[PDB]
Nucleic acid binder design. Structure first.
Ligand code: NA
Length: 91
DNA sequence: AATAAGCGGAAGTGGG
DNA sequence: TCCCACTTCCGCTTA
């Protein structure tokens, strides 16, 4: 199954949920979630995964934080903002 | 208080 | 066996 970071990168490339997520500086890989519309995107992630429970932004962000150590996605010190690694962007 | 984002330890689930 | 890649639950912190 698709990994969370790839799900997000694919959404940003397709523009299918542009009211829930958007690039801040695509060259740097920085992106931001919508305060009011992020839950719809979280719901889609859980359904794509076939998880038992409804997915929430809190649980999705809990998973995102685990990428901090390996580097695929890091939290930026701006509201709802994160950054993909160069390696993720290149693939 | 109400609302919201952010955090992570711990235990559970999936598919190797 | 035992790690993958999260998921779920819970309690806490800061603004
Ligand atoms: Na929030």
């Amino acid at each position: 199954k698709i990994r969370l970071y790839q799900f997000l990168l694919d959404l940003l490339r397709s523009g299918d949920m542009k009211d829930s997520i958007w690039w801040v500086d695509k060259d740097k890989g920085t992106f931001q979630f919508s305060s009011k519309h992020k839950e719809a995107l979280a719901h889609r992630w859980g359904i794509q995964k076939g998880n038992r429970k409804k997915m929430t932004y809190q649980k999705m962000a809990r998973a995102l934080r685990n990428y901090g150590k390996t580097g695929e996605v890091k939290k930026v010190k701006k509201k709802l903002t994160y950054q993909f690694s160069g390696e993720v962007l290149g693939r």
